[PDB]
């Protein structure tokens, strides 16, 4: 348990908005950038998220999706 | 002569029955819609010209008004996505394609530039431009021993459209039209252009930018030690796409990661998280906490190259979301790395910036450094010197923090602080 739970951050209790718990076999599988609920032992529900995280795809530093042609 | 003519005028010409008068009408067209912002793309739209110009793509007895129509409707794809959608509307994409053969270099390049703003639009477009069949022809433009051979401004343009085939990630562009682009991309990452280069990493930042098996196909075509070249040119607009390719690829698996660390890309950070381009440094302190997030061995690898005396100096005085990534960086060190790893994180004077923090209005960061702190005082307890971490937290005014954190209104947070307070203050 502790081997995989290194890989999360608890965020809190148990948040039914992210769905139910999952088990601590199942949280080794969760995908970065996520979050879940997961049953660790013994008993308790705890809402945590992936260390590993994604892109904040800075808009700001994206270049032009398009490009006209203007005269020279 | 064809310049500033009214819509009426063009209108007038271009409904003439004389090909020649067609002609002059559509490059004055072309010159109303390229001599100024903001040119008139709706009223042009409005006219009903885009028909007209898609059969003119076809005229391959009059290469000159393949041109003007070819530049005209770029011009109008490169604006809003209603805009792009009317030239799509009207029948241009296997025009376009079609014209990808054209014996003249400028006309097949004009067609490059606008199947570019057709699939820059959004995946929707791009997938069309792809199942149009672009991608076969837009490659043999591009099948030529030498690069260097080829007009800089083609080749500049050839790669930007490519780069738009493989942008976009809901969805991201099928694995078949990927793996048919990709081997052009590395030798494109090899050509030395500044804006070849910075596309081709920009097309490579989209392509590992998903799930890691997509981070494989790019890994696995040997790019990471050119990007991390890249990551050390002195041009910032071939640096940024470079780190993002970079700290997308260290999102991926422990083994991912690890090729990015085997091609040497530590030692570039010392100057990217001191980068005067605060995205710059934004970005790298971001890629290090997915590096901290990896095995004690990748940890160390952070500890030798000397970057934790960097990820202190981010931590003591960023951007605001530079140091919340600092942050994230430190309670992923702190949760893999081995006591040894970190005691000498804390003699390296983490514990200072990250109280002074714990002021901060974002819930997050505060749950964050919490953590950081408890995961930094079990190392404490293994060696028994918790006393001497809880001294070093009140000097610098963080047991106040701490103390002010158990009012706070998210409950693991003053739950979190409550602890800390009673197990070690």
């Avoid at chain 1, 739970?5 to 995908?31: M, T």
């Amino acid at each position: 348990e502790s081997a995989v739970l290194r890989g999360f951050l608890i965020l809190g209790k148990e948040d039914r908005r992210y769905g139910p718990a999952l088990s601590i076999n199942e949280l080794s599988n969760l995908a970065k950038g996520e979050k879940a609920n997961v049953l660790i032992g013994q008993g308790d529900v705890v809402l945590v998220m992936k260390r590993k995280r994604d892109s904040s795809i800075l808009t700001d530093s994206q270049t032009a999706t398009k490009r006209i042609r203007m005269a020279i | 002569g064809t310049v500033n003519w009214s819509v009426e005028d063009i209108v007038k010409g271009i409904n003439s029955n004389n090909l020649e008068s067609q002609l002059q009408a559509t490059q004055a067209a072309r010159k109303l819609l390229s001599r100024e912002k903001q040119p008139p793309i709706d009223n042009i739209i409005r006219a009903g010209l885009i028909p007209k110009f898609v059969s003119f793509l076809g005229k391959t007895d009059c290469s000159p008004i393949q041109f003007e129509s070819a530049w005209a409707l770029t011009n109008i794809a490169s604006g809003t996505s209603e805009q792009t959608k009317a030239v799509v509307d009207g029948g241009a994409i296997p025009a376009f394609i079609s014209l990808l053969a054209s014996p003249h270099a400028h006309i097949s390049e004009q067609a490059v530039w606008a199947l570019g703003n057709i699939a820059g639009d959004g995946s929707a477009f791009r997938d069309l431009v792809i199942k149009h069949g672009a991608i076969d022809p837009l490659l043999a433009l591009l099948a030529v021993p030498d690069l260097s051979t080829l007009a800089c401004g083609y080749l500049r343009n050839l790669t930007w459209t490519l780069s738009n085939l493989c942008r976009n990630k809901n969805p991201a562009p099928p694995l078949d039209a990927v793996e048919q682009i990709l081997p052009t991309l590395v030798r494109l990452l090899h050509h030395n252009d500044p804006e070849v280069l910075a596309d081709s990493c920009w097309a490579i930042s989209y392509l590992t930018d998903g799930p890691n098996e997509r981070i494989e196909m790019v890994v696995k075509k040997g790019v990471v030690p050119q990007l991390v070249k890249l990551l050390g040119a002195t041009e910032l607009p071939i640096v940024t796409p470079a780190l993002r390719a970079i700290g997308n690829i260290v999102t991926g698996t422990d083994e991912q990661t690890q090729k990015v660390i085997d091609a040497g890309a530590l030692a570039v950070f010392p100057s990217l998280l001191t980068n005067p381009k605060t995205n710059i440094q934004k970005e790298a302190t971001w890629t290090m906490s997915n590096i901290t997030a990896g095995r004690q061995d990748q940890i160390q690898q952070v500890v030798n190259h000397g970057l934790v005396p960097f990820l202190v100096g981010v931590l003591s005085k960023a951007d605001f979301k530079t140091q919340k990534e600092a942050a994230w960086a430190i309670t992923n060190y702190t949760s893999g790395g081995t006591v040894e790893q970190i005691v000498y994180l804390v003699h390296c004077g983490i514990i200072e910036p990250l109280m002074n923090l714990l002021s901060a209005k974002d819930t997050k960061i505060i749950q964050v450094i919490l953590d950081a702190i408890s995961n930094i005082f079990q190392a404490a307890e293994k060696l028994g010197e918790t006393e001497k971490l809880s001294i070093m937290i009140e000097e610098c005014g963080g047991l106040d923090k701490i103390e002010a954190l158990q009012r706070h209104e998210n409950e693991s947070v003053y739950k979190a602080s409550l602890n800390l307070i009673e197990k070690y203050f």
